[PDB]
Design a protein around this motif. Structure first.
Motif, short mmCIF file in Angstrom:
data_model
loop_
_atom_site.label_atom_id
_atom_site.label_comp_id
_atom_site.label_asym_id
_atom_site.label_seq_id
_atom_site.Cartn_x
_atom_site.Cartn_y
_atom_site.Cartn_z
N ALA A 64 -40.28 55.62 -37.01
CA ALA A 64 -41.14 54.81 -36.15
C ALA A 64 -42.54 54.64 -36.72
O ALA A 64 -42.96 53.52 -37.02
CB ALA A 64 -41.20 55.44 -34.75
N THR A 66 -46.31 55.74 -35.53
CA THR A 66 -47.31 55.16 -34.64
C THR A 66 -48.68 55.70 -35.03
O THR A 66 -48.88 56.92 -35.08
CB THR A 66 -47.01 55.50 -33.18
N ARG A 87 -46.81 47.62 -43.86
CA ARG A 87 -45.44 48.00 -43.54
C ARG A 87 -44.54 47.91 -44.76
O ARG A 87 -43.79 48.84 -45.07
CB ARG A 87 -44.90 47.13 -42.40
N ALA A 99 -41.16 50.97 -38.39
CA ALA A 99 -41.57 50.25 -37.18
C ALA A 99 -43.02 50.57 -36.84
O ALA A 99 -43.35 50.98 -35.72
CB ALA A 99 -40.66 50.57 -36.01
N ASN A 101 -46.34 51.08 -35.52
CA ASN A 101 -47.03 50.69 -34.30
C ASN A 101 -48.51 51.02 -34.41
O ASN A 101 -48.90 51.99 -35.06
CB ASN A 101 -46.44 51.41 -33.07
N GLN A 103 -52.00 51.67 -32.05
CA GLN A 103 -52.50 52.02 -30.73
C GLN A 103 -54.01 52.13 -30.78
O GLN A 103 -54.58 52.62 -31.76
CB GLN A 103 -51.89 53.35 -30.25
#
Ligand SMILES: [Mg+2]
Ligand SMILES: [Mg+2]
Ligand SMILES: [Mg+2]
Ligand SMILES: [Mg+2]
Ligand SMILES: [Mg+2]
Ligand SMILES: [Mg+2]
Ligand SMILES: [Mg+2]
Ligand SMILES: [Mg+2]
Ligand SMILES: [Mg+2]
Ligand SMILES: [Mg+2]
Ligand SMILES: [Mg+2]
Ligand SMILES: [Mg+2]
Ligand SMILES: [Mg+2]
Ligand SMILES: [Mg+2]
Ligand SMILES: [Mg+2]
Ligand SMILES: [Mg+2]
Ligand SMILES: [Mg+2]
Ligand SMILES: [Mg+2]
Ligand SMILES: [Mg+2]
Ligand SMILES: [Mg+2]
Ligand SMILES: [Mg+2]
Ligand SMILES: [Mg+2]
Ligand SMILES: [Mg+2]
Ligand SMILES: [Mg+2]
Ligand SMILES: [Mg+2]
Ligand SMILES: [Mg+2]
Ligand SMILES: [Mg+2]
Ligand SMILES: [Mg+2]
Ligand SMILES: [Mg+2]
Ligand SMILES: [Mg+2]
Ligand SMILES: [Mg+2]
Ligand SMILES: [Mg+2]
Ligand SMILES: [Mg+2]
Ligand SMILES: [Mg+2]
Ligand SMILES: [Mg+2]
Ligand SMILES: [Mg+2]
Ligand SMILES: [Mg+2]
Ligand SMILES: [Mg+2]
Ligand SMILES: [Mg+2]
Ligand SMILES: [Mg+2]
Ligand SMILES: [Mg+2]
Ligand SMILES: [Mg+2]
Ligand SMILES: [Mg+2]
Ligand SMILES: [Mg+2]
Ligand SMILES: [Mg+2]
Ligand SMILES: [Mg+2]
Ligand SMILES: [Mg+2]
Ligand SMILES: [Mg+2]
Ligand SMILES: [Mg+2]
Ligand SMILES: [Mg+2]
Ligand SMILES: [Mg+2]
Ligand SMILES: [Mg+2]
Ligand SMILES: [Mg+2]
Ligand SMILES: [Mg+2]
Ligand SMILES: [Mg+2]
Ligand SMILES: [Mg+2]
Ligand SMILES: [Mg+2]
Ligand SMILES: [Mg+2]
Ligand SMILES: [Mg+2]
Ligand SMILES: [Mg+2]
Ligand SMILES: [Mg+2]
Ligand SMILES: [Mg+2]
Ligand SMILES: [Mg+2]
Ligand SMILES: [Mg+2]
Ligand SMILES: [Mg+2]
Ligand SMILES: [Mg+2]
Ligand SMILES: [Mg+2]
Ligand SMILES: [Mg+2]
Ligand SMILES: [Mg+2]
Ligand SMILES: [Mg+2]
Ligand SMILES: [Mg+2]
Ligand SMILES: [Mg+2]
Ligand SMILES: [Mg+2]
Ligand SMILES: [Mg+2]
Ligand SMILES: [Mg+2]
Ligand SMILES: [Mg+2]
Ligand SMILES: [Mg+2]
Ligand SMILES: [Mg+2]
Ligand SMILES: [Mg+2]
Ligand SMILES: [Mg+2]
Ligand SMILES: [Mg+2]
Ligand SMILES: [Mg+2]
Ligand SMILES: [Zn+2]
Lengths: 206, 208, 60
Positions: A64, A66, A87, A99, A101, A103
Motif C-alpha cells: 500500500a 501511505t 510511484r 498504491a 497514498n 495524507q
RNA sequence: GGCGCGUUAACAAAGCGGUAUGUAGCGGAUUGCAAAUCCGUCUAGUCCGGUUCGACUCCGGAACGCGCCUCCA
RNA sequence: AAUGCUAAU
RNA sequence: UGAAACUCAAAGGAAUUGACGGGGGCCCGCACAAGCGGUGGAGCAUGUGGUUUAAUUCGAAGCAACGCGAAGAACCUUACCAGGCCUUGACAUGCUAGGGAACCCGGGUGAAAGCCUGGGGUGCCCCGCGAGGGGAGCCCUAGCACAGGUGCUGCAUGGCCGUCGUCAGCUCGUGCCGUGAGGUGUUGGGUUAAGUCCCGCAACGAGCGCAACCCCCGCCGUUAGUUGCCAGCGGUUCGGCCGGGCACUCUAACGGGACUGCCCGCGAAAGCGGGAGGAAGGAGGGGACGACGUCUGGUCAGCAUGGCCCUUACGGCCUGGGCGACACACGUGCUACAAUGCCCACUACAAAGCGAUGCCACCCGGCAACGGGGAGCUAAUCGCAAAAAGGUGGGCCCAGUUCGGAUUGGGGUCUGCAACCCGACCCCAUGAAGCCGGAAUCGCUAGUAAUCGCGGAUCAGCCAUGCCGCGGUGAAUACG
RNA sequence: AGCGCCGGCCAACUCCGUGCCAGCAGCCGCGGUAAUACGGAGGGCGCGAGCGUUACCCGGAUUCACUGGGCGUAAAGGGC
C-alpha cells in the motif's frame, strides 16, 4: 544510558506499528529489506513536502504505502505529474504493485517529527538555538497540546564545547503508559558538525 | 648494564645510570643528550588534566683508568737537620726530608722518624696522594661542566624532543622532524629520527 | 576496509564455506540475526521505531 | 719496622670439623593509590697451599683494612 | 589507634 | 622607640549556597551480625598484564576493564605479518574519444589473484529486399571530475550505553523576607517503601520524579473443542484406536476478583496492631519502567559526522602465516579431592523451545562415534526427546581406591576444497596433581541458597566449562 | 600623507601562519594544533604634518579626608 524510546515503550498500548504485515521465517527479511529501501527512498524524495510518517502495508504481492505530509500538493503536483512518477520508480524499486497514498496532517504543530525537522532546518540556517527552542515550544503549546519539550545537543552556535539546551512547557509524563506522547528526531549537518534535535508532544491520555 | 638506580614507589626512576658497550655506542647515542618533553594525562592525575613534564638525558664517553705514578725526574729531594729534641743526634743528623714536585711547586716535608730513609718514603707517599687527589678533582670539575652543558636546568623550555600522547606525535625541534608513530618510537624504533639527525650533521658541514 | 568487505561478502565465493552473513543495514559481521538479516544494534534501533512488524518489548 | 686483630650474602653483623639473625629484595593479601601492616620466599664465607673420611671453621703464605709501640742520646 | 596525594579545564 | 632594600596583585571582614568531618540526632541497604554454600591451594577452560615474535590487529582499566566488544578466529571472518599482484580501482554519478560493447563456453604460466587470451550475440526508433550510416538497455581501453581509507582525534561531535541510583530527590510561577548572593514554599510534629499521606505554618499552587496506567504468575466465570483431553456409554488387535462427549485438564481472548473493603482497639488525622471471610491481606510474588544532573565516564572499530592525513598507496586482490606464542602474574569459571559416595541394570515424573541446502521415526551393519535404506512432519498432528537428581536391586569396603580424569601413544567417525600450525566426537591403552586449601575474599532472606538435568541465539563444523532462558528436588538463619 | 590602534577597560573583525615556541603585555591576562589578545593580509576606528613611546607634575585618589575618612570583628583605643 538513561531513557527508553518513548514510542518503543508504548507499542501496542498507545502507539501503533509503522509497518503492518505478516510474514513467515522464509519471507520476513526480504520484505523487511524492501520496506527499508522504500522508506529510505521516500525520505530523500519528500523532504521539502514535510514527510512525517511512512506506513507500509502488504496483502499479497501488493504493497500500500501511505505517506503523511504537510503539503500534499508538493507530493502530487500538477495533475499528479509527480505523484505518478514517484510511484513508477517505486515499482521499479520493488518489482510489485504499489498504491502510494498521500495524507495531509491537520496540525503540523502537533506532529513532533515536523517540529524537530523545522528546528533542525533553522539551526542549519545559522539561526539562534535558544530562541528557536522557545519559539517552537510556544508554537506547540499554542495549538492545544497539554505539553511539549524540545532538546538540542551539540556544538550550539559553533562553539568548541558541546552543550545541551532544552525547553519545556505543560506536562511531559514519560513514565505514564496511557499518555499519548509523540516523539520526533532530526539531524542538523552544520559546517562544524552534527546537532541532534528531539521533540516530545503530549496530546492527552487515552 | 645498569650501573646506578634510584627507583620510586610508583615504578619510575628519579635517576638511572647505565652503560652501552660496543663499537660506536657513543657515536650513535650522542644525539639523545638534552631535555625530553612529554605532554599527556598522568596516571597520578585525578581530574583528567594534561600535564607537561620533562626528563634529562646525559651521554658521556666512558673514560680510562690509567694508574697514577710519580716521575722522579721532576722531583727534588732535600735532606737537612730536624728540629726539636734529641741532643747530639738531632744536632748532627740529616734526618728531615723535603720532596718538591718541580712542575707545580708543591712540597711535602717529613720529620716523623729518626731515620732519613723512612722519612723519605713517607714524604713520597704523601706527595703521591696529594697529586692524585688534585688530578681527580680537576677531572671531576671538567666532567661536571660537560654534564651541565648537556642537561642545563631541565626546564620546560630548552627541550630537544616532544612526545605528545593525545596527538600521538613525536617532534624533534633541532631539525623540525615530526612523526606519528609514538608507540613504535617508545618501543625502541629510533632509527628514522637518528638517521635524520645524522643527515643534518653531515649537511651542516657544507663548506664552502 | 569497510566498503570492499561489504561488497566482497555480497559476492559469490569459490567455496561454499567462504560465505558469511553481514548486516544489511550497517555492514556489521558480528551478531547478525538470520530472521531479520540485521545486527543487534540495528535490530534494537528499528524495533524502537515500530518498523519491525509484530516485534515488541518483552517482559514476563 | 715490631706486636695484636679482622675479611661471611644486598647492607650491618653471629655460632659452628659434618646441621644465624635484623632491615632489605622478590611473589601474594589489604588499600582509590603510596606508605604502614599481614602471608610466603630468598642471595655466602678475600685468594693460594696444606692437615683431615670431611674445611667458612684447624695450620702456612699473600693482599687489604684497623689498633698500639718506635725511647737514652 | 592510623601518615601522605606535585605540576595545564 | 622603630625603618628600608626587595617582593606580591592581593592580603582581609561578614554573610550565602554547597562539599566535607576520626561533629551531633533520626533513619536505611545481604552493610554487619545470625546462617548455608563457595572463591584464594590442584588440574583444566577462558579473558587480561607482561614477555616473545615477521606478526602475535585493535579497543575496554578501581567499584562502573579482565567467559568484556566477540550470539561461534582452520580458509572467510581480519582490521596484523611475509611474498606475489592491480591502478578512476572490489562499490557511485558525470564529461569525452576509440571501439561499440551488452551476455556465454575454451588456451598458456602461476600457490592463487593476475597477465598474456579463442569462438558467437544488443533491444528498440530509422533510409529500409541495399553496401551501410544514425540516436538508444549496456561494456572495455586512454584521459579526467573522482571513488576508497577499521588511517588520527570519543579533549571537536550526534546517536546509544554504563554509573551515582528504583536512591527520594530536583525545581518552577506569583506573593513575601533580605542592600545582595539568596531564603521561604521544601522547615517542625506524626507516618510511609516513597517530597507517601496527615497536622501545623507568609505562603498559595504547580511540574519532573514516587505511585498508578502495561506484561507474567496465583483463584474463578463466558465464548469455543482441533491436531487438545477422555468423567459417563458401546466397541477393541489393548494406543483415545474408533464411535461419541466438551464433564475435566488444557489451549487463548474477553471479564470478575483485593479495595484497610468489614468488626475490636490505639490515634486530630494519616495511619498502626488484632480478627473474620477469602485462592489471594495489607505494595499479593516477579518484570517493564531510571528525575535535574554527575563522572573532560565508554564508543570515530556498529553507524553517522567537523577537522587533519594517504592517493600506481596508509586504497584493492590472492596464497600462506598470526590473532591459538609462554621463565611468569591476576580475574571469572568447570571438574574433583569421596561411602549423605562411585559404578552397573531395570523403572518413573517436567517446562519452555527449535525444525524445509531442515528435524529425522523405524529397520539393517559396526563395541561405538557413525554409515545405508527410509516413513512422518512446511508441524497442539511428525521429530529433536534421553529428561537427570529420584525409586528398586546388585557390586565396590577406606585405599590416591571400581575416588579423580589431566597428559601422552595408537586405531577411527564426521564437517569442511582443506582439521600440521589450529576442530569436534567414538574405541583401546596410559591413569598426573588433588586427602577440603595461608594472609584473605564472594553470593544469598524462600520456592531464595544449594543441587539436577533440558532448550535456544550465533552456527558447515566447533574449541559453549560462556551467555540468555526453562523446569525438578528443596534448606538454614535474622537476637539486634 | 602619515602614525597609532581594533580581547575588556575603549571606537574598531575576519582569514591564514604558528603551536607555553616565536612572541604580546598599563592591569586582568593571551599563546601548550580551529588564537577577534602573537606575526602577516583584507577590512575597520581615531587623529592627521603629524602620530606614537619614555621621563616627570596635578587629576581621577573623599587613597592624609579644612571643604571631605576612620579605629567591637576589616589597619587602627595607650595594661591601669
Ligand atoms: Mg735543629
Ligand atoms: Mg728526650
Ligand atoms: Mg736532626
Ligand atoms: Mg749520627
Ligand atoms: Mg589495509
Ligand atoms: Mg559460516
Ligand atoms: Mg556473520
Ligand atoms: Mg658486610
Ligand atoms: Mg650461617
Ligand atoms: Mg634473613
Ligand atoms: Mg621480607
Ligand atoms: Mg611485597
Ligand atoms: Mg593505601
Ligand atoms: Mg604497593
Ligand atoms: Mg608491603
Ligand atoms: Mg737508655
Ligand atoms: Mg591525609
Ligand atoms: Mg593529605
Ligand atoms: Mg611526604
Ligand atoms: Mg586520609
Ligand atoms: Mg591528587
Ligand atoms: Mg593533599
Ligand atoms: Mg591536590
Ligand atoms: Mg610595599
Ligand atoms: Mg557475613
Ligand atoms: Mg577454594
Ligand atoms: Mg594462584
Ligand atoms: Mg586455583
Ligand atoms: Mg589486547
Ligand atoms: Mg581506535
Ligand atoms: Mg566486571
Ligand atoms: Mg559475566
Ligand atoms: Mg568463543
Ligand atoms: Mg586473507
Ligand atoms: Mg585468518
Ligand atoms: Mg565523552
Ligand atoms: Mg558521547
Ligand atoms: Mg541524590
Ligand atoms: Mg519564588
Ligand atoms: Mg530587598
Ligand atoms: Mg530538597
Ligand atoms: Mg530551599
Ligand atoms: Mg522508591
Ligand atoms: Mg509528591
Ligand atoms: Mg513507577
Ligand atoms: Mg466449556
Ligand atoms: Mg576521557
Ligand atoms: Mg579510551
Ligand atoms: Mg568513523
Ligand atoms: Mg571521524
Ligand atoms: Mg583472542
Ligand atoms: Mg596453542
Ligand atoms: Mg573478570
Ligand atoms: Mg578460580
Ligand atoms: Mg571441566
Ligand atoms: Mg582409580
Ligand atoms: Mg585445525
Ligand atoms: Mg601427590
Ligand atoms: Mg583418602
Ligand atoms: Mg581478593
Ligand atoms: Mg533483601
Ligand atoms: Mg570455564
Ligand atoms: Mg567596543
Ligand atoms: Mg597577547
Ligand atoms: Mg602590538
Ligand atoms: Mg590559527
Ligand atoms: Mg591589544
Ligand atoms: Mg592578527
Ligand atoms: Mg579635569
Ligand atoms: Mg577611582
Ligand atoms: Mg586628594
Ligand atoms: Mg574624589
Ligand atoms: Mg575631617
Ligand atoms: Mg576608610
Ligand atoms: Mg574594629
Ligand atoms: Mg565597627
Ligand atoms: Mg584578626
Ligand atoms: Mg587599613
Ligand atoms: Mg584588628
Ligand atoms: Mg583599654
Ligand atoms: Mg590593643
Ligand atoms: Mg592592667
Ligand atoms: Zn547493523
Amino acid at each position: 544510558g538513561n531513557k527508553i524510546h518513548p514510542i518503543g515503550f508504548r507499542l501496542g498500548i498507545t502507539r501503533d506499528w509503522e509497518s503492518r504485515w505478516y510474514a513467515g521465517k522464509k519471507q520476513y527479511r526480504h520484505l523487511l529489506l524492501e520496506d527499508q529501501r522504500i522508506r529510505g527512498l521516500l525520505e530523500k524524495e519528500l523532504y521539502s513536502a514535510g514527510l512525517a510518517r511512512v506506513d507500509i502495508e502488504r496483502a499479497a504481492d501488493n504493497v500500500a504505502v501511505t505517506v503523511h505530509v504537510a503539503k500534499p500538493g508538493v507530493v502530487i503536483g500538477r495533475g499528479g505529474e509527480r505523484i505518478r512518477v514517484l510511484r513508477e520508480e517505486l515499482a521499479k524499486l520493488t518489482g510489485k504493485n504499489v498504491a502510494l497514498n498521500v495524507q495531509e496532517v491537520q496540525n503540523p504543530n502537533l506532529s513532533a517529527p515536523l517540529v524537530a525537522q523545522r528546528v533542525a532546518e533553522q539551526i542549519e540556517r545559522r539561526f539562534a538555538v535558544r530562541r528557536a527552542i522557545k519559539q517552537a515550544v510556544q508554537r506547540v503549546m499554542e495549538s492545544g497540546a497539554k505539553g511539549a519539550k524540545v532538546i538540542v545537543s551539540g556544538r550550539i552556535g559553533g562553539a568548541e564545547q558541546a552543550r545541551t539546551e532544552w525547553a519545556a512547557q505543560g506536562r511531559v509524563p514519560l513514565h505514564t503508559l496511557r499518555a499519548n506522547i509523540d516523539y520526533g528526531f532530526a539531524l542538523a549537518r552544520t559546517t562544524y558538525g552534527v546537532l541532534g534535535v528531539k521533540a516530545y508532544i503530549f496530546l492527552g491520555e487515552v | 648494564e645498569v650501573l646506578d638506580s634510584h627507583p620510586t614507589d610508583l615504578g619510575g626512576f628519579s635517576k638511572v645510570v647505565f652503560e652501552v658497550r660496543g663499537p660506536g655506542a657513543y657515536g650513535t647515542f650522542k644525539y639523545e643528550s638534552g631535555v625530553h618533553r612529554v605532554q599527556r594525562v598522568p596516571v597520578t592525575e585525578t581530574q583528567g588534566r594534561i600535564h607537561t613534564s620533562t626528563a634529562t638525558v646525559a651521554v658521556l664517553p666512558k673514560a680510562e683508568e690509567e694508574d697514577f705514578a710519580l716521575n722522579m725526574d721532576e722531583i727534588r729531594i732535600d735532606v737537612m737537620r730536624a728540629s726539636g729534641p734529641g741532643g747530639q743526634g738531632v744536632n748532627t743528623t740529616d734526618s728531615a726530608v723535603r720532596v718538591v714536585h718541580l712542575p707545580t711547586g708543591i712540597m711535602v716535608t717529613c720529620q716523623d722518624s729518626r731515620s732519613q730513609i723512612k722519612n723519605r718514603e713517607k714524604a713520597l707517599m704523601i706527595l703521591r696522594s696529594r697529586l692524585l687527589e688534585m688530578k681527580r678533582a680537576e677531572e671531576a670539575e671538567r666532567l661536571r661542566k660537560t654534564r651541565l652543558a648537556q642537561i642545563g636546568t631541565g626546564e620546560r623550555s630548552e627541550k630537544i624532543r616532544t612526545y605528545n600522547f593525545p596527538q600521538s606525535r613525536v617532534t624533534d625541534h633541532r631539525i623540525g622532524f615530526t612523526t606519528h608513530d609514538l608507540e613504535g618510537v617508545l618501543s625502541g624504533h629510533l632509527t628514522p629520527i637518528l638517521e635524520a639527525l645524522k643527515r643534518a650533521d653531515q649537511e651542516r658541514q657544507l663548506a664552502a | 576496509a569497510r566498503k570492499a568487505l561489504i561488497e566482497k561478502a555480497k559476492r559469490t565465493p569459490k567455496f561454499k564455506v567462504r560465505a558469511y552473513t553481514r548486516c544489511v543495514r550497517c555492514g556489521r559481521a558480528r551478531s547478525v540475526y538470520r530472521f531479520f538479516g540485521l545486527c543487534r544494534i540495528c535490530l534494537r534501533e528499528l524495533a524502537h521505531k515500530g518498523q519491525l512488524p509484530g516485534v515488541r518489548k518483552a517482559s514476563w
